[PDB]
Amino acid sequence: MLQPKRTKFRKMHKGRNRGLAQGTDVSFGSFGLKAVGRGRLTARQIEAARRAMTRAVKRQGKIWIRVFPDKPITEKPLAVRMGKGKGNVEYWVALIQPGKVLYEMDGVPEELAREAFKLAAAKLPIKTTFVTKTVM
């Protein structure tokens, strides 16, 4: 599952997740799975969805993952009180805004792309939509 090989800093402020996405076009492949909802995609979710769509295509065509989980999420252990420092990094997330193309695919029929992405979408916490490469 995806994770930055290095980071400048271990822990990151919670932040907020406002705005619409950058990277709203199918820029690499023919077909894309686009976020309609807003949220966090964990590295496990990204992997689960990748394995689903990959198995559907029977290792044919080509798959791009447009999102990368570069935000570390900390958690406090069970039965520890508030404070005493920030919790430990447990997993990595990508912040998703509406419009974000999550995955792209080329070298399959649309029919099979739609099925592969439907199987991937069922692994994700955010509402998605199938999209095609536009001429402009």
Partner 1 sequence: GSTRNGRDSEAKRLGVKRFGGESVLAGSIIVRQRGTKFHAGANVGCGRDHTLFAKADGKVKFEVKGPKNRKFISIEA
Partner 2 sequence: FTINAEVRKEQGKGASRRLRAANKFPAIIYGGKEAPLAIELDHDKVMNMQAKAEFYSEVLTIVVDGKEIKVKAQDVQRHPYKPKLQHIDFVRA
Partner RNA sequence: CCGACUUACCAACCCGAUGCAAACUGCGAAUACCGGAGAAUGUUAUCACGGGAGACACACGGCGGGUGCUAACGUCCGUC
Partner RNA sequence: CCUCCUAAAGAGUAACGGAGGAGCACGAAGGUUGGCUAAUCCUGGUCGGACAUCAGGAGGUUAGUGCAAUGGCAUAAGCCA
Partner RNA sequence: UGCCUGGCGGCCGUAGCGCGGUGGUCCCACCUGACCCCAUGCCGAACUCAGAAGUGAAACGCCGUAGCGCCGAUGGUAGUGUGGGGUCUCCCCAUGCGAGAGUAGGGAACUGCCAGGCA
Q: Could you list the residues that contact partner 2 (CB under 8 A)?
A: 20-21, 24-25, 34-36, 98-99, 129, 134-136
Q: How far is the CB of 136 from partner 2 (least distance, A)?
A: 5
Residues 88-127 that bind RNA (CB under 7 A): 95
The entry of partner 2, partner 1, RNA, none near residue 74 (CB within 5 to 8 angstroms by kind) is RNA
Residues 29-88 that bind RNA (CB under 7 A): 38, 66-68, 70-71, 73-76, 82-87
Report if residue 85 touches partner 1, rule: CB under 8 A: yes
Q: Is 110 left (phi over 0), alpha (psi -120 to 50) or beta?
A: alpha
How far apart are alpha carbons 105 and 29 in whole angstroms? 5
Query: In angstroms, what CA-CA distances link 36 with 13, 30, 52, 66, 85?
Result: 25, 19, 20, 15, 36
Report if residue 5 touches RNA, rule: CB under 7 A: no
How far apart are alpha carbons 113 and 61 in whole angstroms? 10
Report if residue 15 touches partner 1, rule: CB under 8 A: no
